[PDB]
Amino acid sequence: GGLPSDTHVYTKDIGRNVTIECPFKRENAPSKKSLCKKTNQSCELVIDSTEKVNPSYIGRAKLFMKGTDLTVFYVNISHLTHNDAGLYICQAGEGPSADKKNVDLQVLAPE
Ligand SMILES: *[C@@H]1O[C@H](CO)[C@@H](O)[C@H](O)[C@H]1NC(C)=O
Numbered sequence: 001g002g003l004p005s006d007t008h009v010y011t012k013d014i015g016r017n018v019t020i021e022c023p024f025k026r027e028n029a030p031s032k033k034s035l036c037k038k039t040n041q042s043c044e045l046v047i048d049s050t051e052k053v054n055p056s057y058i059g060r061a062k063l064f065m066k067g068t069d070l071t072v073f074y075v076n077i078s079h080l081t082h083n084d085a086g087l088y089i090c091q092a093g094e095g096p097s098a099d100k101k102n103v104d105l106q107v108l109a110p111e
Pocket of ligand 1: 016017018078
């Protein structure tokens with residue numbers, strides 16, 4: 001059951017949607033906001049605030065903020081597939097001072 005530090009787990013049935021919460025600090029409010037998916041030593045872009053999106057998620061992923069809450073962004077992923085399962089990282093900013101949040105998506109799929 002090893003996880004990255006302070007991981008938020010989301011559990012969804014196949015074909016449903018998930019809204020991932022990505023907290024950050026004021027220092028990174030002006031910076032790029034992104035979600036990426038872990039591979040063992042790579043994190044592959046899912047979507048970022050420059051409107052770049054992974055072809056495997058286009059039409060299914062949306063990145064937004066809400067109200068005047070200046071300290072959190074959201075990524076909704078719809079039409080979940082078993083291949084969407086796994087670890088993701090939220091990032092606000094770039095480099096050593098970036099705010100990161102570890103996320104684990106569990107997708108329950110047919111036997
Ligand atoms: C997304 O899932 C929520 C449950 O968290 C549900 O209320 C909502 O209707 C779903 N939206 C779509 C477009 O499937």
